[PDB]
C-alpha cells in the first residue's frame, strides 16, 4: 500500500514526489522549489495517476503553509501542509528510521515516482524500481572513483540493470523493510545520469537527519 506517496504540484503541473511522514508533514528535496511563493504549490495525496484521473474518491489536495529546510549539507525540505492529511484506506504515513541506525547491505528497496520513463506513450501511472542496499565504499568505486560519499548519503544498486529514478522522481522516497516495517531510508535527489547500467544511485540518508526531522515534525 502506497498511501505515503505525495505529488508536489508547482503551477498546476507535477514537479516532484514526496512522502507523508506525519499528517501535516511531507519530506521532499530542495530542488523541488523554483519559487518562494507558496501560492504556486499544492500537494496531492490519494493519487496513483499523475493527472489524478481514476483518483477522485481518494484524491486529497492540500495547500503548503511552510517550508522548513534541512541542514546546509542535505538537499532536504520539510513541507507543512495547510490542513492535516486525513488518514484513510488510500492515504497513509511512512515510518522513519531511528537516529542511531543502519540497514544491512543487499536489503531490498523500492523507488517510486511519476517521473521520466523513457517510454513513448507513458500512461501517467505510479512506477516502481527495485533496488538493493550497497556499501558506501563499494559504491564510490562503482562510480569510477569520481564521487566520494559522506555519512549523510546512501547507496542502492539496481536489481534490473538499466533501472533507476529520473527527472520528475526527485523528492520521492527510497523505501526498504527495516525489522519487518516499511520505512523511508532515502530521498531521491538529482544524480550524475539517469539509470546507468551497473552504476549505483546515491540517495540521502534519512536516518542521518532523523533527529532534525523529529525536531520539526514533533511540535
Amino acid at each position: 500500500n502506497i498511501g505515503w506517496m505525495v505529488s508536489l504540484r508547482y503551477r498546476n503541473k507535477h514537479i516532484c514526489g514526496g512522502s507523508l511522514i506525519k499528517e501535516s508533514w511531507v519530506l521532499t528535496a530542495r530542488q523541488c522549489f523554483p519559487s518562494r511563493d507558496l501560492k504556486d504549490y499544492e500537494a496531492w495525496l490519494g493519487i496513483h495517476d499523475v493527472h489524478g484521473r481514476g483518483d477522485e474518491k481518494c484524491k486529497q489536495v492540500l495547500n503548503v503553509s511552510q517550508l522548513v529546510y534541512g541542514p546546509e549539507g542535505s538537499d532536504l525540505v520539510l513541507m507543512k501542509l495547510a490542513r492535516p492529511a486525513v488518514l484513510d484506506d488510500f492515504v497513509s504515513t511512512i515510518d522513519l528510521p531511528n537516529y542511531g541506525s543502519t540497514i544491512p547491505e543487499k536489503t531490498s528497496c523500492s523507488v517510486y515516482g511519476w517521473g521520466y520513463t523513457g517510454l513513448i506513450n507513458y500512461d501517467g501511472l505510479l512506477r516502481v524500481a527495485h533496488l538493493y542496499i550497497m556499501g558506501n565504499e563499494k559504491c564510490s568505486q562503482h562510480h569510477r572513483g569520481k564521487v566520494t560519499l559522506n555519512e549523510s548519503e546512501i547507496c542502492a544498486g539496481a536489481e534490473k540493470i538499466g533501472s533507476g529514478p529520473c527527472e520528475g522522481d526527485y523528492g520521492g522516497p527510497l523505501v526498504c523493510e527495516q525489522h519487518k516495517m516499511r520505512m523511508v531510508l532515502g530521498v531521491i535527489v538529482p544524480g550524475r545520469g539517469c539509470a546507468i547500467p551497473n552504476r549505483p544511485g546515491i540517495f540521502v540518508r534519512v536516518a542521518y537527519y532523523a533527529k532534525w526531522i523529529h525536531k520539526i515534525i514533533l511540535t
Partner: peptide
C-alpha cells in the same frame, strides 16, 4: 522511473 514496473506489480515479477 526508467526501467521500472507499475506500482501494483510485486517485486518478484520484475
Amino acid at each position: 522511473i526508467i526501467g521500472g514496473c507499475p506500482y501494483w506489480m510485486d517485486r518478484e515479477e520484475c
